[PDB]
Amino acid sequence: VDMYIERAGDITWEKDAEVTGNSPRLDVALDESGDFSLVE
């Protein structure tokens, strides 16, 4: 399997972007395999 990288852009903050998405406050656990879960 040929895994390869290709440039996609410059890393630059964009001025005058409008905020989207909410800001959830979540109780979370992280296991030793790197998986996050929600604490119920």
Binding site: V1, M3, Y4, G9, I11, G21, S23, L26
Partner: protein
């Protein structure tokens, strides 16, 4: 290894994204599982990684050390499969864990967007997108995953 954001492809399908900074390529472990990466005519080998953090670096140690300030809006520089890079500004939420709080962005993109960088207002990479949770309505929230610069 010029600085910038890159797609991670398999031959093609886009399986992720990563950041080249200071000669080191940074992505999420689940994107490559440490496999070698072709870059033009060269090969990049894994140097450091951690399954629990879900991070891997190539060519040298992890270089990204900017931290979310816990207060300010951030930008996901999303590089979705088949689409141009785009900046999405958001106020992070919080993953509250037994080991501390981690900023988290409520932005939902295809699996192959994994590794896209999240930026502060100075353009520094405060972490990578794509290890997260699915909430009750089916939408996604990603940790702002940052490594340690030793």
């Amino acid at each position: 290894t010029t600085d910038g954001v890159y797609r991670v492809m398999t031959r093609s399908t886009q399986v992720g994204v990563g950041v080249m900074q200071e000669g080191v390529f940074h992505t999420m472990w689940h994107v490559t599982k440490g496999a070698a990466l072709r870059s033009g005519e060269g090969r990049l080998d894994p140097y450091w990684g951690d399954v629990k953090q879900d991070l891997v670096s190539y060519c040298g140690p992890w270089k990204l050390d900017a931290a979310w300030d816990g207060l300010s809006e951030v930008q996901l520089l999303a590089v979705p499969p088949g689409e141009r890079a785009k900046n999405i500004q958001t106020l992070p939420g919080i993953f509250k864990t037994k080991d501390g709080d981690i900023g988290a962005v409520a932005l939902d993109y295809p699996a192959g967007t994994s590794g896209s960088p999240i930026l502060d207002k100075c353009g520094r990479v405060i972490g990578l997108y794509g290890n997260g949770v699915v909430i009750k309505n089916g939408s996604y929230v990603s940790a702002i995953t940052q490594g340690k610069r030793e």
